[PDB]
Amino acid sequence: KAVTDMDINELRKLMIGKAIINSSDMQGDLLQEAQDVIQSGIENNSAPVLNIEAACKYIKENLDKKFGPTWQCIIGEGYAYDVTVQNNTLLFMFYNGNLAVLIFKS
């Protein structure tokens, strides 16, 4: 039982609300506001089949009003990127399963 009983397919099915943060470069108080908004927005726009474009459009509009005029966030199953951002303007957190989310302020 426990970890041995658990399987990758089983783990994904068992928990869909688990939140994992891989890279943090933004102030913690700012991260708390951003994390609550992104999780709520993705679930609302997830629909029958998750849309990468749909999730980004909702996140981009919310972030621009929330902090600064030019805010760019990209979410993909797998990607390699080099990004130049302002100090404490980049937060990296990936959702449980094959979902990687990158949000930064330019």
Binding site: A80, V83, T84, L102
Partner: protein, 51 residues
């Protein structure tokens, strides 16, 4: 008394009073201010299903 003397005589300390008035002016100063935005750094992140 001459007419010119009478004209001078007509003016009196009580008859004519002269007051000097000036307006306070702040001293002009020259100052240089330089603004430069927060340092920005390049970040590269690679995400994989296993990671």
């Amino acid at each position: 008394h001459d007419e010119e003397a009478i004209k001078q005589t007509l003016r009196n300390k009580f008859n004519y009073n002269t007051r000097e008035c000036q307006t306070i002016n702040p001293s002009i100063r020259e100052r240089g201010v330089s603004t430069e935005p927060p340092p920005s750094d390049t970040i590269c992140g690679n995400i994989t299903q296993w990671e």
